[PDB]
Amino acid sequence: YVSLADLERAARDVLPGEIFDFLAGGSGTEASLVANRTALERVFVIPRMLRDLTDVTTEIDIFGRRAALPMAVAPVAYQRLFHPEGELAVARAARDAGVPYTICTLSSVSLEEIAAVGGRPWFQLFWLRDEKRSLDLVRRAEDAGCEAIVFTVDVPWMGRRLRDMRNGFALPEWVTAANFDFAPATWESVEAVRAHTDLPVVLKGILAVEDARRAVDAGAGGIVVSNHGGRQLDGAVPGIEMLGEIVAAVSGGCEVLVDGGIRSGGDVLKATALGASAVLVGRPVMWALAAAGQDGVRQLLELLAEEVRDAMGLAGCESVGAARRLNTKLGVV
Amino acid sequence: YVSLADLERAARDVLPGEIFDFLAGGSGTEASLVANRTALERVFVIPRMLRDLTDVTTEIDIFGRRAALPMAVAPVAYQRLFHPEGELAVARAARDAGVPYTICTLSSVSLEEIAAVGGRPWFQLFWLRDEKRSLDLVRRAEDAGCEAIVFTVDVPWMGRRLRDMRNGFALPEWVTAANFDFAPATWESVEAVRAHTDLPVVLKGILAVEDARRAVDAGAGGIVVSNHGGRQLDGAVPGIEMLGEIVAAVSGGCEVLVDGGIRSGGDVLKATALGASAVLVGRPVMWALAAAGQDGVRQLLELLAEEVRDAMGLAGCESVGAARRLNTKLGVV
Amino acid sequence: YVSLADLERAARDVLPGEIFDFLAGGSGTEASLVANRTALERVFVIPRMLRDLTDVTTEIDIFGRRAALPMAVAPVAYQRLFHPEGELAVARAARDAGVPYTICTLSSVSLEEIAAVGGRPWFQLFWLRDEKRSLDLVRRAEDAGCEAIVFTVDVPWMGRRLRDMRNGFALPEWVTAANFDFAPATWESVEAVRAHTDLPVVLKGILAVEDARRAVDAGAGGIVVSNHGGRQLDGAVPGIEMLGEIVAAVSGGCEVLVDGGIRSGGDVLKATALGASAVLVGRPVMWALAAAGQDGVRQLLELLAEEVRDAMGLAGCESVGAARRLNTKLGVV
Amino acid sequence: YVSLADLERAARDVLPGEIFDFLAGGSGTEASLVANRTALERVFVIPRMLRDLTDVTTEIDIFGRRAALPMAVAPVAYQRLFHPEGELAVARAARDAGVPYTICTLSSVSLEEIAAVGGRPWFQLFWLRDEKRSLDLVRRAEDAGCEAIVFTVDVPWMGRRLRDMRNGFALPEWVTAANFDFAPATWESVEAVRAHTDLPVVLKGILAVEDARRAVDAGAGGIVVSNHGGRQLDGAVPGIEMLGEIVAAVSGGCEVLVDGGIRSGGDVLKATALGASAVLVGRPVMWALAAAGQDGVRQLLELLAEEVRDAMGLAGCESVGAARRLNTKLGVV
Ligand SMILES: Cc1cc2c(cc1C)N(C(=O)c1ccccc1)c1c([nH]c(=O)[nH]c1=O)N2C[C@H](O)[C@H](O)[C@H](O)COP(=O)(O)O
Ligand SMILES: Cc1cc2c(cc1C)N(C(=O)c1ccccc1)c1c([nH]c(=O)[nH]c1=O)N2C[C@H](O)[C@H](O)[C@H](O)COP(=O)(O)O
Ligand SMILES: Cc1cc2c(cc1C)N(C(=O)c1ccccc1)c1c([nH]c(=O)[nH]c1=O)N2C[C@H](O)[C@H](O)[C@H](O)COP(=O)(O)O
Ligand SMILES: Cc1cc2c(cc1C)N(C(=O)c1ccccc1)c1c([nH]c(=O)[nH]c1=O)N2C[C@H](O)[C@H](O)[C@H](O)COP(=O)(O)O
Ligand SMILES: O=C(O)C(=O)c1ccccc1
Ligand SMILES: O=C(O)C(=O)c1ccccc1
Ligand SMILES: O=C(O)C(=O)c1ccccc1
Ligand SMILES: O=C(O)C(=O)c1ccccc1
Ligand SMILES: [Mg+2]
Ligand SMILES: [Mg+2]
Ligand SMILES: [Mg+2]
Ligand SMILES: [Mg+2]
């Protein structure tokens, strides 16, 4: 594989169509899904030349750990849909690559099993029924050694995914929510989480500048600027289009991550140049999982690592910090 | 049906081609028809997160009545072209959905019969021959219980609809103007209407900011910012592109509606975020009518209601007022 | 015929391919040819409503004559290429429509014969060899009753027309320059013309704002803002994109015409809304000529007249002056 | 041949596919390769009229020599890939056309042989292993009569060229680096070069404004604003999009060249209008070489010379200096 796009083709060959559609699709007319890619394609980087590149490093420190790349695996529910080893295959590959893995509330293997893989994992929270049960999930994750709580805040309910409706898609009986034997989150819920853990709380799905500022005020340690990969509000602005404004508004008060459409090391470089601390990558990780299980995900991460290093150095950046200081220009495509 | 586009395909199957073209077409090169869609596709919403959604309501108060959605059925002449029950099928479905229905001057069932369906209907006026006859139509509508007069002001004469000319289209002898056994409107005509009724007068087809301001000065209770679905001046700006400027200029002095290209609840949300009080929907209502008569229109309204609620809540809006306070960003497509 | 595009198809059927290409083509990669159309398609008009339209008139006064439309036939050399009656067929149709016809220096019928048709014609000048011979052409045109001298100033030499080169195109021996049995123009040449005639001198092919101002300073009675239909510099800006700036800079000091890509009455309305006094139309006139000779051109002019009236009134303009006061908005297509 | 595009088709016919791909391709998704063309296509020139064109000249003085056109042949490694005479065929044609030829560090014929052709050549440097060996290449080039050192500064290492990876491309054993029997450059390397030669040092691959200013401060005699033909960082801004800003920032302190996508004399004119001293042309020279060897390159240069003269005069420019004073307008395509 020489690009992330090689893996999509390979996943399409192997997966049943309805599963590939669950993975690929967006809500509504898929306008936000397409705009995630359009928005990245319009961004051009202004590289710097003639800088010392004797020890180019792609590492970052985030949420108290060193990561090998400015990248984490995004929360994607029900990974046994894509391969029988599901979340364990992905978490092992992430660990070995030095990349954070986000364990999902709707994981198809229990959070404790995935955390046992090692690799200092993060945990993604959906707000439950009950303040008490939500807080018990958080405490489970913390007791298992998760290092951050990624509170997904863009899902008061699930978006209308027309491919899934047309397909009549539903979970095979062999895939379950392994953390179990939901209610809309508010700012009060965020406070309840923050008060119940010493881990950093990261709010995922922020797009409005004032919501970014309020996240800082609320004691978040990070946010993920995101339209949920075009799967929630159809017509929501891409996160990459809000990122620069959000980074300026928080003015270093929390880590600012982005996701949606990241498909190469060049894309990671664009996100960092716009001010991102790191990115999340969703669909490509699942394509690699579907195509070749753990070794697929390892090869994907390897490929991304090489593309990130290549892009950084071509742009004159010996560190991710330097990449954040790059300027950009909007083009037409 | 899971999108409004399912119904277009179904209407194309059933209708004779020349009738489908009368419905679908625009004037000239159809540049304004296409731009109505392009303009909406370029608008992205910036959703808000973590707000209380315990009683999300899509209701609005407009022209003295509660409506179930920020939406009304647009005036479309000669609805028996599309189904034998024509206007009665549509008005019944609108009533049952709690959506205003606009009865047309060129309705193929008499205004009194349609008003008898109930549902507190509006009446669309074309200026006649004669100040006296125009005012008699208005008085008929008012006597029948219509609640607003939608004065169409963008038709000094009909636009050049090339599909209809190429087809040699004409009304089947079984479709007539049931209100009967036209001259260009001016501001004087508006005053004559305003002086002759206590109902709100809504001027439909306003695009210039100064015409919006003058509409307020003239005592209009509303305007519909509109290029007549691309059927009048070919090259007229889409209403959605003028809406924000117009809303700022009237500064609450009348209700500001918009139409042209509204094809989903997401589109309704975009219109409200740009400052619209409500939208009109034209062609999609007729597709549903053609496809399945009254029950078709009911299903369409049901679908739109669900899409509006879904979009609002995903955007953090518990009310239409809150949706009006959303910000937007123009993208490229 | 219900659009100008019907006539192009009809001309393509009848003309030999190499002649159709001489007519259709542009220079270089035809980037300026395409941009003439793109530029018009991006312009949207903001129509006005509810104005008195009791005597809508499309007439203008220009260069001391009433014209029936804000339009003239552009100078197109060698019109016998397209029909055996050539320039006489076109000039007769123009006369009967009340539209100015521009007689070309490279006309395939002598200027005196064409002027004898009547209709108060204009004369287009190319600068010759010789100040003396150039001035003799001007005096011929004036003696024959031409009413303006359209000095083409964008042809120091002919552009590189790759269709013609690829075709090995050349004039059939039956088509000649009937005014005869060239050197680049300068501002000195303009002065020599201005000093030798009392007719208005109109400089055709101006695109720079400072050249428009200098044209006024030089005593021009008009300019034609033009990239020569994309046939001269490939990559020259479309005239329609310079028009508004030029109109503001001359501030009523001369008539400001535009050409390139005008294909409907809606396009004429856009040009006037951007500040044009009138337009020239080139290729469409030749399509009508090729398709049906004099009666073809009559039908074209009839069609354009109806489209101009239709567009004006739909836009709330009772006169061309009012159309010049319309505002516009740039869109995306 | 009547356009540069005729030669691409001819090169595609003759070259083995993997060689054509080595020539045509870019890095990554080829976004920067495509953007080089898009960026030029968006630029329109505002031509001037009625200026004296009695002795239009396309000549410039650069780096102490007269050149016949504001153009040089770009450094392209391994030209024996394309024709058996390789660099000698191209250098001879360049000499005869009065165009500078850039001899490459990775030339497939030795720099001394190519310099012996005559035509006052330039030499392109890649930084070696060793300050000492790099400086020996420079001294060789100077001893052989090269007139400028084009220090390529955008290649700390080679970009990821996916066509080449997919093809498993490698140099045929009959093509070698004839200057031999690499380490990343820094500003210190530039200083080492500047101190070791009296020739002008030209830094090729600058895109950031501050790097342009620093190049002047460092004693460069020129820069080439360039993204390396889309072959280095994928997502690097096109040079043509940075050019105007860079020209203003250096304010005459060094020559400012540009490359990437120049495919006609019209494109050369656009580059000059944006402030370029001259352009480099890469791929088209190799297409002509592949198609017809030395005589191919001669015909290409002949064609470009005619297109440059044609464009200049159509734009009212008697000299390249005048072309630099032309204004431009960005369009949509
Ligand atoms: C491709 C995909 C993405 C999700 C799920 C399932 C699938 C198949 N997720 C879910 O299906 C899920 C989402 C909401 C409610 C219930 C299940 C999921 C989720 N987010 C999140 O915080 N919890 C979930 O568990 N997402 C979004 C994901 O984290 C991410 O924002 C993006 O994928 C980014 O863009 P990409 O790199 O272009 O793919
Ligand atoms: C699709 C359609 C739209 C009309 C008619 C017929 C048809 C088949 N109408 C007419 O045909 C009509 C219009 C002018 C003169 C005589 C008949 C009509 C009209 N308006 C209005 O105020 N009285 C009429 O009665 N319109 C415009 C309509 O109210 C509306 O502005 C839009 O349809 C909005 O865009 P959409 O949601 O994209 O379709
Ligand atoms: C389509 C066409 C246009 C010309 C000629 C021949 C043909 C076949 N003309 C010539 O062929 C001609 C031009 C330069 C030198 C010798 C012959 C011509 C000319 N101009 C002008 O002032 N004298 C000439 O005589 N033009 C340009 C014309 O006046 C006009 O600017 C446009 O056609 C406008 O755009 P359109 O409406 O999109 O077609
Ligand atoms: C088309 C092409 C372009 C290069 C090479 C090989 C080929 C086949 N060059 C190389 O292959 C090369 C580049 C880096 C490392 C080793 C070999 C090359 C180079 N630059 C440079 O300074 N030394 C090298 O020697 N370039 C870039 C070239 O100078 C130029 O910037 C552009 O080609 C401009 O755009 P274009 O007119 O659209 O083609
Ligand atoms: O009710 C839903 O839409 C749903 O399944 C869900 C899942 C996760 C979070 C919130 C809602
Ligand atoms: O005369 C017309 O164009 C016409 O039919 C009409 C219809 C309604 C309103 C105004 C004019
Ligand atoms: O020499 C030319 O290019 C030519 O034919 C011409 C024609 C008219 C005007 C100027 C030049
Ligand atoms: O190591 C490389 O990528 C390489 O081949 C190279 C070639 C020229 C300059 C610098 C690096
Ligand atoms: Mg992503
Ligand atoms: Mg609508
Ligand atoms: Mg024209
Ligand atoms: Mg180039």
Encoded amino acid at B63, one letter: F
Instruction: Give the largest CA-CA distance in chain B.
Output: 59
Q: How far is CA B256 from CA B38, B225, B259, in A?
A: 21, 7, 10
Q: Which residues are CB-contacts of D149 (< 8 A; sequence separation ≥ 6)? A: D122, D123, D124, D125, D138, D141, D142, D193, D197, D199, D200, D201, D202
Mind telling me how many Å the CA of B45 is from chain A's nearest CA? 5
Residue B210 is encoded by which pair of tokens? 């100064």
Query: Which of D176, D180, D178, D202 is closest to D190 using CA atoms?
Result: D202
- The answer to whether the CB atoms of A48 and D236 lie below 8 A apart is no
- Which segments of A270-322 are extended strands (E)? 278-281
Residue pair C286/C307 in contact by the 8 Å Cβ criterion: no
Closest CA to C176 of C86, C73, C282, C113: C86
Within a domain: A331: no
Angstrom distance (rounded) from CA A274 to CA A245? 9
Tokens linked to D122: 């330039």
Question: What number of C-beta contacts closer than 8 Å exist between C and D?
Answer: 102
Q: Please indicate, yes or no, if residue D130 is contained in any of the structural domains.
A: yes
* Counted domains in chain D: 1
Candidate from D157, D234, D237 with C-beta closest to A46: D237
H runs (alpha helix) in A109-208: 111-116, 131-143, 162-167, 187-196
DSSP per-residue letters across A36-69: HHHHHHTEEEE---S---TT----EEETTEEESS
Task: Name residue D126's amino acid.
Answer: F
The closest of D94, D69, D64 to D79, measured between CA atoms, is D94
Chain position carrying tokens 């002759």: B196
Length of chain D as a residue count = 333
Sign of CA dihedral D63, D69, D71, D72: negative
Task: Tell me the DSSP string of B67-111.
Answer: ESSSEEEPP-S-GGGT-TTHHHHHHHHHHHHT--BEEETT-SS-H
Count CA within 13 A, CB hemisphere, residue B330: 8
Q: Tokens standing for A277?
A: 């601390």
Gap sites in chain B (C to N > 2.5 Å), preceding residue numbers? 181
Q: Beta strands C102-104 and C327-330: pairing type? A: unpaired
Chains with 3+ CB–CB pairs under 8 A to B are: A, C
Q: How far is CA A216 from CA A61, A200, A223, D225, in A?
A: 19, 12, 9, 41
- Extract the tokens encoding B211: 């015409």
Are the CB atoms for D297 and D243 separated by under 8 Å?
Answer: no
Other beta carbons less than 10 A from residue C267's beta carbon:
28
Atom of ligand 5 minimally distant from the CA of A156: 10
Distance CA D299, CA A256 (A): 56
Q: Nearest Cβ partner of B208 from C3, C48, C307? A: C48
Dist. CA A280–CA A100, nearest whole Å: 9
Where are the alpha helices (H) located in D75-175, listed in sequence order?
86-97, 111-116, 131-143, 162-167
- Return d(Cα B21, Cα B89) in angstroms, integer: 21
**If DSSP codes are grouped into helix, strand and coil, which group holds residue C87?**
helix
Q: Nearest to residue D260, comparing CAs of D242, D287, D235, D282?
A: D282
In one-letter notation, the amino acid at residue C231 is R
Which of C97-133 are b and which e, b meaning 16 or more Cβ less than 10 Å from the residue's Cβ? bbbbbbbbbbbbbbbbebbebebbbbbbbbbbeeeee
Q: C61 in helix, strand or coil?
A: strand
The rounded distance, in Å, linking the Cα atoms of A222 and A245 is: 15
Contact C97, C120 (CB under 8 A): no
Closest C-alpha among D178, D73, D63, D193 to residue D127: D193
Nearest to D329 among C42, C166, C241 (CB): C241
Task: With respect to residue A332, please indicate whether it lies within any of the assigned structural domains.
Answer: no
- Residue B249 CB: number of other CB atoms within 10 A? 17
Q: Tell me if C10 CB under 6 Å of ligand 7.
A: no
Structure-token pair, residue B94: 């609108």
| DSSP state letters, D166-184 | HHT----TT---TT-----
Which residues on neighbouring strands pair with residue B73, listed in sequence order? B101, B281
Helices (H) and strands (E) in chain C, counts: 13, 12
Q: Do C44 and B238 touch (CB under 8 A)?
A: yes
In a domain, A101, yes or no: yes
Q: Which of D145, D151, D72 is nearest to D113 (CA)?
A: D145
Q: How many residues does chain B have?
A: 333
Q: Name the residue among B209, B194, B290 with its Cα closest to residue B248.
A: B209
- Based on DSSP, count helices (H) and strands (E) in chain D, helices before strands: 13, 12
DSSP C173: T
Give the list of residues 6+ apart from residue A183 with CB closer than 8 angstroms, or none.
A127, A128, A129, A130
What does the alpha-carbon distance between residue A114 and residue A102 come to, in Å, rounded to a whole number? 10
Question: D155 is written with which tokens?
Answer: 């290649």
Three-class DSSP category at A246: helix
Contacts of C248 (CB under 8 A, 6+ apart): C275
Q: Which of B57, B304, B54 is nearest to A156 (CA)?
A: B54
Residue C177 identity: A
D332 occurs within a structural domain: no
Report the distance separating Cα C145 and Cα C124, nearest Å. Answer: 13
Q: Give the separation between CA A324 and CA D139, rounded to whole angstroms.
A: 39
Mutate to test the pocket of ligand 3, among C228, C240, C259, C285 (most ligand atoms within 8 A of CB): C228
- Write the CB contacts of D170 (distance below 8 Å, at least 6 apart in sequence): none
Which ligand has the nearest atom to the CA of D229? Answer: 4
CATH number of domain containing C282: 3.20.20.70
Instruction: For residue A63, report the phi and psi dihedrals to the nearest 5 degrees.
Output: 55, 40
**Residue D66 parent element (H or E):** strand D65-67
Structural domain contains residue C333: no
B126/B185 Cα distance (integer angstroms): 8
The answer to whether A314 contacts D154, with C-beta atoms less than 8 Å apart, is: yes
Please give the distance of CA C164 from its chain centroid, rounded to a whole number.
Answer: 22
DSSP strand pairing (D278-281 vs D65-67): unpaired
Residue D321: count of CB within 10 angstroms of its CB: 10
Q: Helix axis angle, C209-217 relative to C239-250, nearest 10°?
A: 40
- Cα separation, C221 vs C219, in Å, equals 6
Chains A, C in contact: 3+ Cβ pairs under 8 A?
Answer: no
Residue B333 lies in a domain: no
Contacts of A309 in chain D (CB under 8 A): none
Nearest-CA neighbor of B228 among B205, B246, B207? Answer: B205
Secondary structure (DSSP) of B14-33? HS-HHHHHHHH--STTSHHH
Ramachandran bin of B118, using left for φ above 0, alpha for ψ from -120 to 50, beta for the remaining angles: left
Q: Which residues surround ligand 9, an ion (CB under 5 A)?
A: A 259-260, 262, 281
* Ligand 3 pocket list (CB less than 6 A): C 22-23, 36, 74-77, 104, 106, 124, 152, 155, 158, 204, 226, 228-229, 259-262, 280-283
Size of chain A, expressed as the number of residues it contains? 333
Q: What distance in Å separates the CA atoms of residue D162 and residue A6, rounded to the nearest whole number? A: 11
CB contact under 8 A, C233 and D52: no
CA separation for the pair B35, C41 (Å, rounded): 10
Considering every ligand atom shown, identify the ligand nearest to the alpha carbon of residue C204 and give its number.
Answer: 3
> Which residues lie below 8 Å from residue B251, measured CB to CB, with a gap of 6+?
none
- Alpha-carbon distance of A311 to A136, in angstroms, equals 42
Residue A47 amino acid letter: P
Q: How far is CA C229 from the centre of its chain?
A: 9
Tell me the residue ranges of DSSP E strands in D21-59.
43-46
Report the DSSP pairing between strands A327-330 and A60-62. unpaired
- The 8-class DSSP code of residue A245 comes to H
Question: Where is D156: in which H helix or E strand?
Answer: none
Q: Of the candidates A177, A113, A178, which has an alpha carbon nearest to the alpha carbon of residue A146?
A: A113
Q: Whose C-alpha lies nearest to ligand 4, atom 11?
A: D77
Residue tagged 């004693």 (tokens): D219
Q: Which of A154, A159, A234 sits opposite B49 (nearest CB)?
A: A154
Contact A2, A9 (CB under 8 A): no
Residue B192 tokens, joined: 């004559």
Alpha carbon distance D123, A76 (integer Å): 54
Beta-carbon separation of C49 and B206 below 8 A: yes
Map residue A128 onto helix, strand or coil. coil
CB contact under 8 A, C266 and B28: yes
Distance CA C247, CA A1 (A): 58
The pick from B128, B154, B161, B182 for probing ligand 6's pocket by mutation, whose C-beta has the most ligand atoms within 8 angstroms, reads B182
User: In the numeric block, which tokens belong to residue D234?
Assistant: 């994928």
* Neighbouring C-beta atoms of residue D66, cutoff 10 Å: 10
Q: HSE on the CB side for A309, CA within 13 Å?
A: 16
Nearest to residue D125, comparing CAs of D114, D133, D117?
D133
- Beta-carbon count within 10 A of C220 CB: 25
Pairing of strands D255-258, D278-281: parallel
AA identity, residue D203:
L
Question: Are β-strands C255-258 and B255-258 bridged in parallel, bridged antiparallel, or unpaired?
Answer: unpaired
CA–CA–CA angle B292, B293, B294 (5° rounding): 120
Burial class (CB in 10 A: 0-12, 13-18, 19+), C41: buried
Rounded distance between C-alpha atoms, residue C283 and residue C90, angstroms? 12
| Residue A248 CB neighbour total at 10 angstroms | 12
Q: Based on the residue annotation, tell me whether C228 is a catalytic residue of this protein.
A: yes
Contacts of B213 (CB under 8 A, 6+ apart): B249, B250
How far is D32 from D27, CA to CA, in rounded Å?
8
Please check whether residue A92 is in contact with residue A294, taking contact to mean a CB–CB distance below 8 angstroms: yes
Which amino acid type is present at position D78?
Y
Chain B residue numbers touching A35 (CB-CB < 8 A): 44, 331, 333
**Interface touch C46/B207, C-beta < 8 Å:** yes
Q: Are C79 and C108 in contact (CB under 8 A)?
A: yes
Query: CA-CA distance, A198 to A196, in Å (whole number)?
Result: 7
Task: List strands edge to edge, sheet with D149-152.
Answer: D71-73, D278-281, D255-258, D222-225, D201-206, D149-152, D122-125, D102-104
Distance CA C287, CA C74 (A): 13
Q: Which residues of B are catalytic?
A: 228
Whole-angstrom distance, CA of residue B146 vs CA of residue B242? 29
Nearest in space to D87 (alpha carbons), one of D114, D125, D112, D106: D114
CA dihedral B229, B230, B231, B234 (to 10 degrees): 160
d(CA D318, CA D325): 12
Q: Tell me the two tokens of residue C45.
A: 């008009």
Alpha-carbon gap, residue D94 to A142, rounded angstroms? 71
> What is the rounded distance in angstroms from the CA atom of residue A58 to the CA atom of residue A70?
7
Q: Residue A72: helix, strand or coil by DSSP?
A: strand
Cross-chain CB nearest to A211 (options B48, B264, B306): B48
Beta strands A71-73 and B71-73: pairing type?
unpaired
- Burial of A12 per CB tally in 10 Å (0-12, 13-18, 19+): middle
Question: Min CA distance, D242 vs chain A (Å)?
Answer: 9
Q: How many CA atoms lie within 13 A of B166 on its CB side?
A: 15
Separation of alpha carbons C71 and C278, rounded Å: 5
Chain B touches chain A, with at least 3 Cβ pairs below 8 Å, answer yes
Q: How far apart are CA D25 and CA D5, in angstroms?
A: 16
Give the Å distances, CA to CA, from B231 to B227, B245, B284: 7, 23, 16
Q: At C118, is the secondary structure helix, strand, or coil?
A: coil
Of the candidates D275, D241, D245, D244, which has an alpha carbon nearest to the alpha carbon of residue D261? Answer: D241
Q: SS3 of C7, please?
A: helix
| Structural tokens at position A48 | 């710097």
CA–CA gap between residue A243 and residue A257 (Å, rounded): 9
Contact in structure between A130 and A101 (CB atoms under 8 Å): no
Nearest CA-CA partner of D97 in D241, D258, D285: D285
* Resolution of the structure, angstroms: 1.6
Other CB atoms within 10 A of residue B307 CB:
24
Task: Give the separation between CA B80 and CA B113, rounded to whole angstroms.
Answer: 14
Q: Is residue C22 part of a domain?
A: yes
Phi/psi for B189 (5° steps) reads: -65, -45
Contact: D238, A47; criterion CB under 8 Å: no
Under DSSP, the state recorded for D33 is H
Which one of A83, A120, A228, A270 is the catalytic residue? Answer: A228
Give the residue before each break in chain D, using a C-to-N cut-off of over 2.5 angstroms; say none if it is continuous.
181
Distance (angstroms) between ligand 10 centre and the Cα of C50 equals 22
Contact B29, A190 (CB under 8 A): no
Distances (CA, A) of C140 to A92, C89, C145, D118: 91, 21, 9, 58
Q: Count the alpha carbons within 13 Å of B154 in the hemisphere toward its beta carbon.
A: 27
- Show me where chain C is broken: residue before each gap, C-N > 2.5 A: 181
Residue B279 region by backbone torsions, left for phi larger than 0, else alpha for psi between -120 and 50, else beta? beta
Range of D208's domain? 4-325
**Separation CA B165–CA C140 (nearest Å):** 47
Task: Tell me the CA end-to-end span of chain B in Å, nearest whole number.
Answer: 26
State which amino acid sits at residue C260. Answer: G
